[PDB]
Design an enzyme around this catalytic site. Structure first.
Site, PDB file in Angstrom:
ATOM      1  N   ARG A 222       5.116 -35.385  27.313  1.00 39.84           N
ATOM      2  CA  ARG A 222       4.769 -36.279  27.322  1.00 39.84           C
ATOM      3  C   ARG A 222       4.532 -37.164  28.598  1.00 39.84           C
ATOM      4  NH1 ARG A 222       7.049 -37.766  21.355  1.00 39.84           N
ATOM      5  NH2 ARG A 222       9.000 -36.555  22.228  1.00 39.84           N
ATOM      6  N   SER A 223       5.837 -36.667  29.108  1.00 41.07           N
ATOM      7  CA  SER A 223       6.043 -37.601  30.343  1.00 41.07           C
ATOM      8  C   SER A 223       5.116 -36.706  31.632  1.00 41.07           C
ATOM      9  CB  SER A 223       7.455 -37.030  31.075  1.00 41.07           C
ATOM     10  OG  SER A 223       8.171 -38.092  29.545  1.00 41.07           O
TER      11      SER A 223
HETATM   12  O1  LIG Z   1       9.701 -34.930  24.520  1.00 41.59           O
HETATM   13  C1  LIG Z   1       8.706 -33.864  25.151  1.00 41.59           C
HETATM   14  O2  LIG Z   1       6.649 -34.394  25.254  1.00 41.59           O
HETATM   15  C2  LIG Z   1       8.971 -32.560  25.399  1.00 41.59           C
HETATM   16  O3  LIG Z   1       8.232 -32.425  26.576  1.00 41.59           O
HETATM   17  N1  LIG Z   1       9.807 -32.093  24.975  1.00 41.59           N
HETATM   18  C3  LIG Z   1      10.213 -30.533  24.733  1.00 41.59           C
HETATM   19  S1  LIG Z   1      10.128 -30.056  26.365  1.00 41.59           S
HETATM   20  C4  LIG Z   1      11.200 -28.058  25.937  1.00 41.59           C
HETATM   21  C5  LIG Z   1      11.492 -29.215  24.316  1.00 41.59           C
HETATM   22  C6  LIG Z   1      10.966 -30.144  23.954  1.00 41.59           C
HETATM   23  C7  LIG Z   1      11.681 -30.726  22.442  1.00 41.59           C
HETATM   24  O4  LIG Z   1      11.448 -32.517  22.783  1.00 41.59           O
HETATM   25  O5  LIG Z   1      12.219 -29.883  21.350  1.00 41.59           O
HETATM   26  C8  LIG Z   1      12.857 -27.978  23.588  1.00 41.59           C
HETATM   27  C9  LIG Z   1      13.504 -26.751  24.955  1.00 41.59           C
HETATM   28  N2  LIG Z   1      11.841 -26.464  25.386  1.00 41.59           N
HETATM   29  C10 LIG Z   1      11.297 -27.385  26.611  1.00 41.59           C
END
Ligand SMILES: O=C(O)C(=O)Nc1sc2c(c1C(=O)O)CCNC2
Ligand SMILES: [Cl-]
Ligand SMILES: [Cl-]
Ligand SMILES: [Cl-]
Length: 300
Positions: A222-223
């Site tokens: 999202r960032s």
């Molecule tokens: O919060 C976000 O938009 C985001 O990119 N989250 C991400 S990226 C990402 C994860 C997550 C998560 O929230 O579980 C889990 C492990 N791999 C990459």
């Protein structure tokens, strides 16, 4: 119609969003993350596969351990910087506000909820009640909720951050998007752009301030989507020229500074929609801003 709209239609017609997105992943920069992977930093990282590159990591100004999982995204042509970071952990909330203090940020953009999909995606790092301020003993900082403005899908908070060592204080604005799902997209370009323009209008992106801090759970999906849209709109605006903006090239430039920015092909597709729609405001139709506010149903 703009060239990015023509590209958008051809990708949609040929069903190529997944292939275009994977091309970006293949071409993206790969730099070392040796500090992030040191054994003593293991409990400073939320996700083993999400780390800041060494060359762009934010260093805390403390001598014990300067590591935080945070990256400076320095967009040279756009002349805007962002700090992208993971949602703080229960042991890194003091480091987070230390970084806000030392980097002179005026705004924090939070794109996630503390609990999503049944799991704790981010620590409760700011106070929910005016009368219950927080003290971060390790970094000697005090954080008080001054006021909040709760809308239907986002909340804006005014916080006071105090350096207890010097007793200087600063007002930090917290922009909290509460209806954007993890690995998902906002409900519409309108509600996304309404929020994005709320941040812009606050003055938090002014070059008189340090870089705005942007985070979600990992600080990449999202960032990255928020930052790509914001940077592309700013570039279009500097030049008053939608056709000088190559959205995929901007994303690849951002990924020189932090890995994994934008985590799904639908988030990439959404970024295009947000930039195409926001271009109407940039190019001199200010009434779309009112239209977005109405379509977003922000009132409660
Ligand atoms: O919060 C976000 O938009 C985001 O990119 N989250 C991400 S990226 C990402 C994860 C997550 C998560 O929230 O579980 C889990 C492990 N791999 C990459
Ligand atoms: Cl170590
Ligand atoms: Cl947590
Ligand atoms: Cl990726």
């Amino acid at each position: 119609s703009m060239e990015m709209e023509k590209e958008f239609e051809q990708i949609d017609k040929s069903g190529s969003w997944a292939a275009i997105y994977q091309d970006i992943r293949h071409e993206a920069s790969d730099f070392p993350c040796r500090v992030a992977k040191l054994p003593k930093n293991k409990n400073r990282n939320r996700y083993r596969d999400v780390s800041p590159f060494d060359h762009s990591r934010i260093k805390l100004h403390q001598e014990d351990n300067d590591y935080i999982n945070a990256s400076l995204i320095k967009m040279e042509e756009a002349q805007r910087s962002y700090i992208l970071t993971q949602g703080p952990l229960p042991n890194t909330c003091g480091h987070f506000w230390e970084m806000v203090w030392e980097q002179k940020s005026r705004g924090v953009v939070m794109l996630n909820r503390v609990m999503e999909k049944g799991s704790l995606k981010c620590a409760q790092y700011w106070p929910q009640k005016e009368e219950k301020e927080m003290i971060f003993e390790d970094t000697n900082l005090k954080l008080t909720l001054i006021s909040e403005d709760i809308k239907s899908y986002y909340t804006v908070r005014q916080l006071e951050l105090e350096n207890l060592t010097t007793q200087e204080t600063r007002e930090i604005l917290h922009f909290h998007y509460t209806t954007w799902p993890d690995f998902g997209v906002p409900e519409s370009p309108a509600s996304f752009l309404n929020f994005l323009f709320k941040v812009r209008e606050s003055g938090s992106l002014s070059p008189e301030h340090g870089p705005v801090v942007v985070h979600c759970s990992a600080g990449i999906g999202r960032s990255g989507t928020y930052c790509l849209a914001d940077t592309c709109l700013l570039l279009m605006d500097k030049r008053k020229d939608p056709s000088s903006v190559d959205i995929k090239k901007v994303l690849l430039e951002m990924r020189k500074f932090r890995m994994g920015l934008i985590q799904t092909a639908d988030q990439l597709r959404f970024s295009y929609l947000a930039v195409i729609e926001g271009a109407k405001f940039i190019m001199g139709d200010s009434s779309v801003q009112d239209q977005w506010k109405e379509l977003s149903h922000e009132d409660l």
